[PDB]
Homo-oligomer: A and B are copies of this chain.
Amino acid sequence: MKINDDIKELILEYMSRYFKFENDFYKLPGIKFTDANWQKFKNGGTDIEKMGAARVNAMLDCLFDDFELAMIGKAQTNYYNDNSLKMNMPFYTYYDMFKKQQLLKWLKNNRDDVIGGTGRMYTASGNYIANAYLEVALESSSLGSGSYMLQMRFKDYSKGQEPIPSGRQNRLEWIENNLENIR
């Protein structure tokens, strides 16, 4: 993993997907931006590399599952080693493609193990954004209490917005049918 402007961009991009109002994210505990300092952060005023470690990792911990944080790092290695990747696309876009390919790998080699659900996002105001993202996990990677070693998050970007159905097979079929609609 490497903390740079590519991570700042990834944070701002993922913040905009999961939160309707920015204040629900930047005023969260451990993040706590003042309205003025947040605007400074977004506009390129404060360097992420010199920012407090706990603050930067609280932003990442909120927007990403710990397995996704692993994928971010692995994608970074691939991204900085290939000039064709940097030439054609920004980092956050390559990461999404890297993540999608991991899902396709799970769907090909671990299909009977693929489980899905809906994730909730905690806001600064104390409330929850119900159905903030789709969660995909490998059931056997179970850690107890709804925790999984191998877990990913996707946002449904379809125009139609097919409602995610209940049931193991119904959800597996929904994922396989919405592969081009999720990011």
Residues of A within 8 A of B (CB): 1-4, 48-58, 60-61, 66-67, 69-74, 77-78, 81, 102, 109, 140, 143-145, 147, 149
Contacts and interface: CB of A to CB of B under 8 A. Distances in A.
A113 to B, nearest CB: 10
A2 B54 CA distance: 7
B1 A53 contact: no
Nearest to A142: B105
Contact of A66 (B4, B54, B74, B145): B74
B66 A1 contact: yes
A56 B53 CA distance: 6
Contacts of A102: 149
A58 B7 CA distance: 14
A-B pairs, top 4 by smallest CB distance, nearest first, are: A66-B73, A70-B70, A49-B54, A53-B56
B53 A52 contact: yes
Contact of A54 (B3, B69, B72, B144): B3
Contacts of A54: 2-4, 48-50
A70 B66 contact: yes
B109 A140 contact: yes
Given A53-B48, A57-B1, A61-B2, A145 B81 contact: yes
A56 B73 CA distance: 15
Nearest to A109: B140
